[PDB]
């Protein structure tokens, strides 16, 4: 993210969410969580279709 310096291999930079849901995510944490989450929704909608044809 443009808020980071280069070659940052730290956990904060690469998407470790330090915080609980109670404490609430930082905006970086939020966006990475988001990125991960979107991957979920996709391979849900995928494994749905693939599951279907398989069953048929």
């Amino acid at each position: 993210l443009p808020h980071f310096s280069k070659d940052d291999y730290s956990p904060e930079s690469k998407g470790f969410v330090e915080n609980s849901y109670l404490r609430g995510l930082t905006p970086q944490e939020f966006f990475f969580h988001a990125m991960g989450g979107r991957e979920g929704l996709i391979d849900t909608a995928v494994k749905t279709a693939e599951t279907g044809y398989i069953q048929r």
Partner: protein
């Protein structure tokens, strides 16, 4: 020390629908993605005319 710019406010990475979700930074990531679609199936005053 090398800063060039500042974010005006992080909450503007968000879209319209999402900007109604309260404390969305306390939710499982997709619980937001739903409500930011469901609120478009809600009810209220859409225009005063």
């Amino acid at each position: 020390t090398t800063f060039t710019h500042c974010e005006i406010h992080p909450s503007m990475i968000l879209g319209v629908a999402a900007s109604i979700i309260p404390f969305p930074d306390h939710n499982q990531s997709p619980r937001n993605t739903y409500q930011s679609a469901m609120g478009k199936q809600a009810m209220g005053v859409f225009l005063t005319n």
